[PDB]
Design a protein around this ligand. Structure first.
Ligand code: MVM
Ligand code: MG
Ligand code: MG
Ligand code: MG
Ligand code: MG
Ligand code: MG
Ligand code: MG
Ligand code: MG
Ligand code: MG
Ligand code: MG
Ligand code: MG
Ligand code: MG
Ligand code: MG
Ligand code: MG
Ligand code: MG
Ligand code: MG
Ligand code: MG
Ligand code: MG
Ligand code: MG
Ligand code: MG
Ligand code: MG
Ligand code: MG
Ligand code: MG
Ligand code: MG
Ligand code: MG
Ligand code: MG
Ligand code: MG
Ligand code: MG
Ligand code: MG
Ligand code: MG
Ligand code: MG
Ligand code: MG
Ligand code: MG
Lengths: 153, 25, 63, 396
RNA sequence: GUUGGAUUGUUCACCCACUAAUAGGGAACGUGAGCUGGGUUUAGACCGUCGUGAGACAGGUUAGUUUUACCCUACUGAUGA
RNA sequence: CCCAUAUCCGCAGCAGGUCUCCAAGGUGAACAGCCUCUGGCAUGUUGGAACAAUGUAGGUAAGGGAAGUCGGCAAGCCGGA
RNA sequence: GCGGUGAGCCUUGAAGCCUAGGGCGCGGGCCCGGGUGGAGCCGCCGCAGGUGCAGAUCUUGGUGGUAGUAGCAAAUAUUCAAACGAGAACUUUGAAGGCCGAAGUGGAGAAGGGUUCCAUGUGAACAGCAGUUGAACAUGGGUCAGUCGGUCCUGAGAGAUGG
RNA sequence: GUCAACAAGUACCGUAAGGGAAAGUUGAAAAGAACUUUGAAGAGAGAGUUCAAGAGGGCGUGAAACCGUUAAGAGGUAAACG
């Protein structure tokens, strides 16, 4: 459509979006920071080990109250988690982007995740019931996601 | 969400009442 | 698929509770296309739906 | 305003911080003062806590209530296999302390000591000290070694040998040995250096360090208790039964001013697994290991000249959570820090022992060997069988 | 280092007993998101005195809801840089 | 058709509130408490892994036996016949 | 905003908005370049005001930090296999293990609700995890009386007419 | 500006008397995206319409607070400022 960071040559690259995905924003953001720059095969293998809890996701900015993991010293950091829903929606989008590379004739064994970002999407509203007859918001924080897979070897 | 004016009035009374019981002049 | 209707009708045509209705687990889709009470009675005569007996509460020790 | 009733302060500020120990072996922080008029001798040794039993002996305290009577003392068995000396390190006196000058290792370091240098023995290629050992069989590297001894002879004031235990004589899961620097007192530096070169690659038994009935210091890491609140960690008074939001607490943690919590107030946190050095533990027996002598092994290292039974120091069923002690052991009076299987550092004392209790010649009379895995009744196996009689499961 | 007690809400006081000694104070009359709520202590009630009265009493008596930390710091531990 | 730990009122699938009919076997004085049969349900708006502090609810405790506290508060003792 | 005036400006790009671009003014502010935009706008001379905002526990709307934190702990309890399905801790069927224990967590009503009843279908929202499930959403269907009630009667009481 | 430019005395609230909102704009024209492809779908990638989708069915313009990303610079006396 209209992305941030159009690729350096729009012939050796493909792309995919996803809008109003109901993941958390903060958990999807730290997952995408892990995936940025990885080769496409390494990223898929990594993102399925988050769902099996063999390799963690280092939470760096959004980390208040996040516990400390033994797998996180691999990333040079202390605290980490294993976001399952954030990893699964980043596998649907990545499989989508891989098939966008086969529609336009690229070798998908050389793709590298160049650009990735998540944005905050419009919030969804529910309600919660509190002590002395009060209603509070119980909002949700969905996300937009976009990525560019430029191939290089 | 709807905010009820009365819930505040009731709470205020409790706070005022609590101050009187807890405070000796 | 889901046999919630069939369990209810098989207790009504048979006058037990739902805890005494045995649906055959192996014949689980011949029961599933039985949406009426004539078709439930036919499966009872066939033997796919049996009523279970009561569990024993003997009075032997208090006798 | 003042406290109306004064009470002594809970806990000691001289053991702060109450953190987990950064080490696990137990560090000598102060060896005995070296005077060269003495002979040349080692100052420390490294044994493992096996378990406790109790003894009977007759007391010679002239003028006491227990004089010429039988008391029961609680002892601690520390199992001490011979340490293997594999290195020498020399220190020089500096205006900033005592830096290490030069380190020389032996030619053949065993795999249980080479296992110490790795975090994962199973994935390594076992390459430690392999380019180093070739200069003991060289000429251009050989001449480097005696220049590194003679410079260490003419500069160093402190010599320390690098020794290790041998874990394959122990019943434990661990195979990785424990290294230690044990310093050498007595004699001149040249005199204590060529002593240590003779000892290099060889074994040092524990009775060549410690004697019968001398008082030694025991260094180690205490038994870890985890995260404990202030009633267990600092032994504060519990608050009464009718306290809202809990009672196992310290009620006031400071006044208004200074507007800060001081370091002296009891707080919750880690209890146990602290490094501690306790002194004046008297040796009661240096026990001999199981040796195979005339084809069958002599196993009577808990016998006395009053008991004459053919029993080992092992209770029936073995030491609980430890195993059995087939090696040389030390019998200390009282309790020592750490769990069972804890490595204890035991060094000679820093003081001059002049008290009458410190110079008491002891003479053991009975060593208990009842099973510690319950209320044991029988000192040996041959006693229990001779009392109980033939059971059902024997006569099959 | 300077305690255990009887009476009292007590601070104080006084007494019993022990002890080497049973010194004096401070810290928002240290310390209530530490407690307790005994003294004071709103609304109930009784007595005395006062007031024509409603009521009052720096007089006695009895009953009377004690809220929140998940933030920053300090502190205690724990990774880490 | 619901008639209520989800169809009603309480801002809600809210431990509150809201009038009745029928009523098995054992124990026992008993429509008491406990266990079961008919009938009903899936633990009350989430699971998993651990077994630290502090809690909340429940227990036990040598030797003393109210010395605790404003106060025997709380618990314990007592118990049927 | 109005009366006048600039043979004013403008789809060959007005307003508005943005700007590490150029400058001017002591300042209020203004002019120009560039980008975006897509139809109107401005200068002088007078005229007229609902005429300039950081504050008011200001009003309305939006949004943060807190924070992926508090939390999702009242009433003992689940487990194995299969089926359907893209997908099963939660659906259904079976098997076990249990609880309500007849003053029931059972079976029917009165008030009150108003279609929630019952089928089939969906799988977005909602059911504070999840759902192949639902009291949700869609599409259809369903309440039959001389004897069961209302209806009739009077009760406490309410209430016209004559006055 | 009337509370109401719109399915407004409407939805909703209260036993009742009464109280009482929010909400305008695709484009000239629906030409409202055929078809292919990944996915269970939502959603994407191409392709196409149009002067324009940087106009894609709460769609003119699209500010700030706030957020993501890239780029550059820096970082132990909280930032900020003369
Ligand atoms: O629940 C409360 C309660 C406690 C505090 C607040 N407060 N206080 N300050 C406040 C400021 C803002 C909001 N709420 C506030 C409100 C209520 N109780 C209560 N406690 C003490 C006095 C009065 C009451 Cl009513 C009940 C009484 C019944 C037994 N359980 C406790
Ligand atoms: Mg926490
Ligand atoms: Mg004093
Ligand atoms: Mg309390
Ligand atoms: Mg034992
Ligand atoms: Mg305070
Ligand atoms: Mg308080
Ligand atoms: Mg009182
Ligand atoms: Mg009063
Ligand atoms: Mg009188
Ligand atoms: Mg009078
Ligand atoms: Mg419920
Ligand atoms: Mg439970
Ligand atoms: Mg459950
Ligand atoms: Mg006791
Ligand atoms: Mg007393
Ligand atoms: Mg007292
Ligand atoms: Mg009581
Ligand atoms: Mg005007
Ligand atoms: Mg303003
Ligand atoms: Mg949490
Ligand atoms: Mg029960
Ligand atoms: Mg029913
Ligand atoms: Mg019922
Ligand atoms: Mg949900
Ligand atoms: Mg239904
Ligand atoms: Mg345009
Ligand atoms: Mg446009
Ligand atoms: Mg327009
Ligand atoms: Mg608009
Ligand atoms: Mg227009
Ligand atoms: Mg727009
Ligand atoms: Mg940078």
């Amino acid at each position: 459509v209209r992305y941030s960071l159009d690729p350096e040559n729009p012939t050796k690259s493909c792309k995919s979006r996803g809008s109003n995905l109901r993941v958390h924003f903060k958990n999807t953001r730290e997952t995408a920071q892990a995936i940025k720059g990885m080769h496409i095969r390494k990223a898929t293998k990594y993102l399925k080990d988050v769902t099996l809890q063999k390799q963690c996701v280092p939470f760096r900015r959004y980390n208040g109250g996040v516990g400390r993991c033994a797998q996180a010293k691999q990333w040079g950091w202390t605290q980490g988690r294993w976001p399952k829903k954030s990893a699964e929606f980043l596998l649907h989008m990545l499989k989508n982007a891989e098939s966008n590379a086969e529609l336009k004739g690229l070798d998908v064994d050389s793709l590298v995740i160049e650009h990735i970002q998540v944005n905050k999407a419009p919030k969804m509203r529910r309600r919660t019931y509190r002590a002395h007859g009060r209603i509070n918001p119980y909002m949700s924080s969905p996300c937009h996601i976009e990525m560019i897979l430029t191939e290089k070897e | 969400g709807l905010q009820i004016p009365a819930i505040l009035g009731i709470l205020g009374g409790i706070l005022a009442l609590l101050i009187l019981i807890l405070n000796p002049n | 698929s889901m046999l919630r209707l069939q369990k209810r009708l098989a207790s009504s045509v048979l006058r037990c509770g739902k805890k005494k209705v045995w649906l055959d687990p192996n014949e689980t889709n011949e029961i599933a296309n039985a949406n009426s009470r004539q078709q439930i009675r036919k499966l009872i005569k066939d033997g796919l739906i049996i009523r279970k007996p009561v569990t024993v509460h003997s009075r032997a020790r208090c006798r | 305003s003042h406290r109306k009733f004064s009470a002594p302060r809970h806990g000691s500020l001289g053991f702060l911080p109450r953190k987990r120990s950064s080490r696990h072996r137990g560090k000598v922080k102060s060896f005995p003062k070296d005077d060269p008029s003495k002979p040349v001798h080692l100052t420390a040794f490294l044994g493992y806590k096996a378990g406790m039993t109790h003894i009977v002996r007759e007391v010679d305290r002239p003028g006491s209530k227990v004089n010429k009577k039988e008391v029961v003392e609680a002892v601690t068995i520390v199992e001490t296999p011979p340490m293997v000396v594999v290195g020498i390190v020399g220190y020089v006196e500096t205006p900033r302390g005592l830096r290490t000058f030069k380190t020389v290792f032996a030619e053949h370091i065993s795999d249980e000591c080479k296992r110490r240098f790795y975090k994962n023995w199973h994935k390594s290629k076992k390459k430690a000290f392999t380019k180093y050992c070739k200069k003991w069989q060289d000429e251009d590297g050989k001449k480097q070694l005696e220049k590194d001894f003679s410079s260490m002879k003419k500069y160093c004031q402190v010599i320390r040998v690098i020794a290790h235990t041998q874990m394959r004589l122990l019943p434990l899961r661990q195979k990785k040995a424990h290294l230690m620097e044990i310093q050498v007192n007595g004699g001149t530096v040249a005199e204590k250096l060529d002593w240590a070169r003779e000892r290099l690659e060889q074994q040092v038994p524990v009775n060549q360090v410690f004697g019968q009935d001398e008082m030694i210091d025991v260094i180690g890491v205490t038994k870890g208790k985890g995260y404990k609140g202030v009633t267990s960690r600092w032994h504060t008074k519990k608050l009464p039964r009718k306290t809202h939001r809990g009672l196992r607490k310290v009620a006031c943690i400071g006044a208004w001013h200074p507007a800060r919590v001081a370091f002296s107030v009891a707080r919750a946190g880690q209890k146990g697994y602290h490094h501690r050095t306790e002194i004046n533990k008297k040796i009661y027996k240096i026990g001999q290991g199981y040796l195979i002598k005339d084809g069958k092994l002599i196993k009577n290292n808990a016998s006395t000249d009053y008991d004459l039974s053919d029993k080992s120091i092992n209770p029936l069923g073995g030491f609980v959570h430890y195993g059995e002690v087939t090696n040389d052991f030390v019998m200390l009076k009282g309790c020592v820090v750490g769990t069972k299987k804890r490595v204890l550092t035991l060094r000679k004392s820093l003081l001059v022992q002049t008290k009458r209790r410190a110079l008491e010649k002891i003479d053991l009379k009975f060593i208990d060997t009842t099973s510690k895995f319950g209320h044991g009744r029988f000192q040996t196996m041959e006693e229990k069988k001779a009392f109980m009689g033939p059971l059902k499961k024997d006569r099959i």
